[PDB]
Design a protein around this nucleic acid. Sequence first.
RNA 1: CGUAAAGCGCACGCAGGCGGUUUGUUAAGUCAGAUGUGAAAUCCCCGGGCUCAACCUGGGAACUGCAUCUGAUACUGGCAA
RNA 2: GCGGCCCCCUGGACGAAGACUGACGCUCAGGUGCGAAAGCGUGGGGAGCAAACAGGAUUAGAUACCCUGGUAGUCCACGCCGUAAACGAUGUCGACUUGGAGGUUGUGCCCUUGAGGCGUGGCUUCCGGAGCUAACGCGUUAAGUCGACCGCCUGGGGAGUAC
RNA 3: CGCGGGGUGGAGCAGCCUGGUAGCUCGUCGGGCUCAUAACCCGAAGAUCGUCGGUUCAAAUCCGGCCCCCGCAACCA
Lengths: 93, 226, 156
Amino acid sequence: MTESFAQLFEESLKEIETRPGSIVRGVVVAIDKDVVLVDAGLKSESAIPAEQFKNAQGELEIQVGDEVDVALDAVEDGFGETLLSREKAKRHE
Amino acid sequence: ATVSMRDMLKAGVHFGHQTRYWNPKMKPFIFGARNKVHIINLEKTVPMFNEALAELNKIASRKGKILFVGTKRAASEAVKDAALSCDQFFVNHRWLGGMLTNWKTVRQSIKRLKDLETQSQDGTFDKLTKKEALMRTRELEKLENSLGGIKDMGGLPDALFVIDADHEHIAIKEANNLGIPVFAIVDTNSDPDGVDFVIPGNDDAIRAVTLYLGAVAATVREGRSQ
Amino acid sequence: ELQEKLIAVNRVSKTVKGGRIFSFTALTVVGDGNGRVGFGYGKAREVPAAIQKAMEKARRNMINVALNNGTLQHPVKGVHTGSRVFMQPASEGTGIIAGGAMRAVLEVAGVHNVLAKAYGSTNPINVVRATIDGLENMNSPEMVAAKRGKSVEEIL
RNA sequence: CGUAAAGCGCACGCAGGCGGUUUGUUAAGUCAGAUGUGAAAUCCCCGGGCUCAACCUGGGAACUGCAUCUGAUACUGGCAA
RNA sequence: GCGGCCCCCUGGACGAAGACUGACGCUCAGGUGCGAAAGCGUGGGGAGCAAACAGGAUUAGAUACCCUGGUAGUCCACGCCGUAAACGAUGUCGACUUGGAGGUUGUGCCCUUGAGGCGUGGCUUCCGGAGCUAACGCGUUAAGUCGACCGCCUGGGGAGUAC
RNA sequence: CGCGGGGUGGAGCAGCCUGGUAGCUCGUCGGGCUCAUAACCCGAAGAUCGUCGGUUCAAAUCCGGCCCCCGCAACCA
Ligand SMILES: [Mg+2]
Ligand SMILES: [Mg+2]
Ligand SMILES: [Mg+2]
Ligand SMILES: [Mg+2]
Ligand SMILES: [Mg+2]
Ligand SMILES: [Mg+2]
Ligand SMILES: [Mg+2]
Ligand SMILES: [Mg+2]
Ligand SMILES: [Mg+2]
Ligand SMILES: [Mg+2]
Ligand SMILES: [Mg+2]
Ligand SMILES: [Mg+2]
Ligand SMILES: [Mg+2]
Ligand SMILES: [Mg+2]
Ligand SMILES: [Mg+2]
Ligand SMILES: [Mg+2]
Ligand SMILES: [Mg+2]
Ligand SMILES: [Mg+2]
Ligand SMILES: [Mg+2]
Ligand SMILES: [Mg+2]
Ligand SMILES: [Mg+2]
Ligand SMILES: [Mg+2]
Ligand SMILES: [Mg+2]
Ligand SMILES: [Mg+2]
Ligand SMILES: [Mg+2]
């Protein structure tokens, strides 16, 4: 069954949006003291600083496995790191 | 074992780096470009991935020693855990330039690690003013982090499986100098000239590396179990 | 069984703050006399350490040469930096006719009969590099027939 | 022939050198064969004679050239399109 | 080499689309022309600047650097000169050989949604691969792979001097 | 004292001749393997080449002695 990579890839591009500035729902893969790994469906899971998850009271409001809204800033910062800025996504809110 | 194109696309293998940072050698494996991003061709990946698995299966069936290499913060934990699942060897922190070509020096460091750990464990002494003992334990800890994955390697490995060939170019160069075959996940920005078995795919995503590593560890255990 | 020859030893200097620091270099070539020949450089403070370091380096870094009954397959030209080397096969009993640096490498490799000439700089280090490079870049009737997709006699 | 000696300060341009592609013809270059000649000695090969060798000597090859004749038409030249 | 603005006369280059000629081409000894600055000749002009020169200083000395003046010259017209580190220290012409970031000047297409995106020509700056190089470096504007033609080199000094 | 040959990790053999590099086999300790022992694998340990010297930039090799070993040696009532 030669389901073309061309066919399969057109479908994938229709699912996710790759424009810089789109808010993408991402899964919390791990929560470190300073960074939270958030997958989105791009080249790499983004290490988002925990400082962005701290409320005005300083608490980390997130657990592992939650979907988090992250603003897609850049897919490739020259190092294969997908820069995700959830703090900018709160502007829409 | 066997991985599917659907699974690899799900894993995100097809993504590559920006177009400007590419290596023109990679051109055969590049499907095209979208949004200034190179898209690796998975039709080239799958037969190459299976073709590499066959040779790894063969080596494992000949009691071959496999060295898993990847020191990216992304893949450091995955390579260690995946390598341990199949009773093989790994390097998950900075590759020491000359681990293979200067093995005679690394072996002496292994001897020091073994002797040092014997004292702090078998010798149990630590009755050394409590400051010389403590600093000696620090040295034990330092060597353990550096050489834990190969401390019992004994000799030169029979093959290297490396994540991010461009990042770990040094290890690939030592192997070529010593004739050791290299299996490498090669991103669009990497150089495939030094790799005997090229597996073209994304090398920065934990999902993709886990896909690669799970399959390799599964094939190695099958080759050993035979 | 490996045969080794010292080609040249040289004294170098470093001119440290206190004065000149003298160290020695070696040039050695090892070979099996049957188509395998390597060369090592070797550098040390004393001549014996230098020659020993060179021989060990020369035992590895050894390459294989498609000899033909102690003679070259065909004329070859080898150039490293400023040394250009020409070697052509000769009939049995001619001897090895070549300059000193080329003499050693051809003897040790097993070329019994060769006519050779060195053009350009005759610096021993580069002459040896150039002759080894030329010998490696010399193909044989079987490998050329395999490459060209034919048989030997079809090539003759 | 960037820095070691060595690219005219730059341009136009006569003589000269070189010439995309296709067909026909020619046969100048080129190629093949034959013929004449290329003195003898000398050099080279196989021999012979001085007791050996130097030396002498028989036959051959060579003298890489030139001219004429007869053929070939790939390439180069001429002519025609 | 060319730098305010305007007019007049005039040379080249590039692009798009189409038509036309039908090898009409490349290089070029000698030859001819152009050729910074200084300089020369005739005649003008002369604000500033400034070799020479005058003076004041500095200095062991100061025929210099520094200061105050200042002639030729620098400017115009017409002739001559014909040389520069006249340099990319790289002759002209053609073909071929991975990439990236730009600048400048055309042109085609897509949603111009709003200076966007995607192609395709010319010239140009930087980085760098193979390759080359003695090394430094050059690297599609080559010093890479080649082809045609031309100029020049042959140890340093004597000497780009003598005749 | 005769002549010849040999001596090399604890044992058995290459290495010697041509001067530059110590290898092969058993044993021993440990680990993997095996349910276990054993066999097997990964390692690791163990000679200064009998010793004394000489030569040489440099010796297991080349030179000599001593020390043994092995073999031969015409002569026991
Ligand atoms: Mg010379
Ligand atoms: Mg100079
Ligand atoms: Mg010069
Ligand atoms: Mg010029
Ligand atoms: Mg011209
Ligand atoms: Mg023609
Ligand atoms: Mg003509
Ligand atoms: Mg003719
Ligand atoms: Mg004659
Ligand atoms: Mg006779
Ligand atoms: Mg005769
Ligand atoms: Mg013709
Ligand atoms: Mg013709
Ligand atoms: Mg001229
Ligand atoms: Mg003037
Ligand atoms: Mg005047
Ligand atoms: Mg006047
Ligand atoms: Mg003044
Ligand atoms: Mg000049
Ligand atoms: Mg100029
Ligand atoms: Mg310049
Ligand atoms: Mg010049
Ligand atoms: Mg460059
Ligand atoms: Mg003159
Ligand atoms: Mg002059």
